[PDB]
Structures are given as C-alpha cells and as structure tokens.
C-alpha cells in the first residue's frame, strides 16, 4: 500500500519541518536575548565602573534661589542680570 507510506511520509515531513522551524526560532530567541544581555550588560558595566572610579544644605539652597532668579529673568526676557 504505497499510498499509506506516501501519506505518513508527508505527514512526518510536515512534523519535522515544523519541529525544525520551532527549534530554529528558539535558538534565534536565545541568541538574540544573549546579544541583548551583552549590550545591557556592558551598559550596566560602564555605569558601574563610573561608580567604581568614584571610590579611589543651606548653601545649595541659596545658590538655587539665585539660579531660579537668574533663569526667571531669562525666560521673561528681562535684562540678563550678572550671575
């Protein structure tokens, strides 16, 4: 019954085609996620190392009131006062 052989063959062919496409997609997902982990990992690494080389108040409030006054005379286009 060559017919049944043919049909089971075509069916298993479809099954293998789908399983292979599935595994290929899964590997693509894994590798893409890997490159993503690498990129974001380098970003965390750089922010980190910048924190690493970092290891070997009232005044700011006055400066901030002053800066607010300055930019305020800026936006209104007033004569730019001497900071």
């Amino acid at each position: 019954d060559i017919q049944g052989f043919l049909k089971n063959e075509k069916d298993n062919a479809l099954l293998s085609a789908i399983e292979e496409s599935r595994k290929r997609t899964f590997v693509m997902a894994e590798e893409y996620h890997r490159e993503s982990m690498l990129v974001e990992w380098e970003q965390v690494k750089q922010r980190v190392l910048h924190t690493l080389l970092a290891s070997g108040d009232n005044v700011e409030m006055a400066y901030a009131r002053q800066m607010y006054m300055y930019n305020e005379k800026v936006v209104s286009g007033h004569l730019q006062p001497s900071l």
Partner: protein, 249 residues
C-alpha cells in the same frame, strides 16, 4: 531642581534638542513628580500648568513621550491623563477601555478603586462627549461602562431597559440577525466592551431567571428559553446557556 534646570533654557545638545526638555523628562520620570513640573490634568480636561510651562510655550511632544514612558511602566491611569493633556483622544479611549475591562466585577464598594475608576471614566466620557467613529466608540464605551456598573451593582431593571433601548445585545433568538448587525457595525471602543456587555446581559437574564424560579417549572422553561435564544444570537454563548440549563436542573 527644575529652577536650576531652567538655567539651561537655551542649551542645545550636539543633536539639537533642548537640554531643558531632557532634564525635565528625566526628573519627572524619576521623581514621580510629573504633576508639578509638567502639570496635572483636572477632571474637566483643562491643563493645570507645570513649572516647565514657565520656560517654554509648548510641551506637546514632551507630554506624548512621557505618556509613552508611563505606558511602558504599566502606568495606565497617568498615561491616560497625560495623553489626555496632549490632545490625543485615541490613546485616551484605548487605555480607558483597557482598564475598564476588568472593572466588570464589584466588591469592597469604597475600598476598591471601583469608585475611583468609575469617577475617572465618567469624567473622561463627559470630556469627550463635550469635545463619528471615535466619538461613537467613546460614548458607547461609556454606556457599556454604565451597563457593567449596574451589572456589578445589582441594578437590574433600569440597565436591562437601557440595554433593550440600545439594541447592542440581542434578547431574542430572531434578534440573532439584529445582534450581528450591531456587533458588525459599531466602532472600536464599543466592540472592545462588547464581550463584557454580552456577559453582563446574560447574567442579568440569569438573575431574573433565578428570582422567577426562587409556576416554578414554567419559570425554568422561560429561563432556558431566553438562554438558548441569546445563544442563537451571539459558540461560547451556546455552551454557556446549555451549561446554565444544566446547573439550574
């Protein structure tokens, strides 16, 4: 910090953007304080100013991108309010529907944001109705919110009446035809509510059935009749109605 960042008002990056906008965005997104720096949207849909409104005239793209960030953060309600400020009703209705969907069920009356979400939805619906496809989807989504409210509240008579008047859900087997027409003709923000609208109309029929049954067998007959007629109206419906006929027996 924004008073300091106003000092970079004229600064341009190497790519031409205003350092003011970038700093304001990073701050508002970081400090959970968008409401102060960029403003807050009142109930009527008018923009209460932010501090960053003092240094520039227009913050449309700012509002859009920040609403996008809040979306990314899963911050639904604030994204709705922000896009609402940016004059984008489409995204507004989108998020409104997205959230109103699970609002089908009501418990812990005041404790749950049920009241809060109801108020916000009512205000947004009023805003859009005062402000054919988008508006019809909107107003029908609002009536659907009302229907879901009466369903989750035990308000049964008035909401079934309004349902009859709306001709969105079929209550008769022949209305199968009618149902298709309505469900096929309406716009987006209404069809998004169509699923829960069907569920609530069915359960309203169901509680009326039980109150009738709770003359008896005739009540069970009329109940399963309405069930199968609604089934013919709407696959899921037929399984549900067969199941209800099973359970009440």
């Amino acid at each position: 910090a924004l008073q300091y960042f106003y000092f970079l008002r004229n600064e341009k990056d190497n790519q031409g953007e205003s350092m003011f906008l970038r700093c304001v965005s990073e701050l508002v997104i970081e400090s959970r304080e968008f409401d102060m720096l960029l403003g807050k949207l009142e109930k009527d849909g008018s923009r209460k100013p932010g501090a960053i409104d003092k240094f520039t005239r227009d913050t449309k793209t700012i509002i859009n991108k920040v609403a996008s960030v809040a979306e990314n953060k899963g911050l639904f309600e604030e994204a709705a309010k922000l896009y609402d400020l940016a004059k984008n009703p489409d995204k507004v209705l989108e998020l409104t529907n997205k959230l109103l969907s699970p609002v089908v069920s009501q418990i812990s009356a005041p404790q749950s944001n049920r009241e809060r979400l109801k108020n916000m939805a009512l205000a947004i619906a009023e805003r859009y109705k005062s402000q054919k496809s988008i508006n019809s989807t909107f107003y029908l989504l609002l009536d659907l919110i009302t229907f879901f409210d009466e369903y989750h509240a035990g308000h049964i008579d008035l909401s079934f009446d309004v349902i009859e008047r709306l001709k969105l859900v079929p209550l008769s087997q022949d209305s199968v035809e009618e149902r298709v027409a309505a469900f096929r003709n309406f716009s987006d923000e209404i069809r998004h509510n169509l699923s829960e609208i069907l569920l609530a109309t069915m359960n309203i029929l169901f509680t009326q059935y039980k109150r009738l049954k709770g003359v008896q067998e005739d009540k069970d007959s009329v109940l399963r009749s309405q069930a199968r007629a609604l089934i013919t109206f709407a696959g899921d419906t037929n399984a549900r109605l067969v199941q209800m006929e099973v359970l009440m027996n």
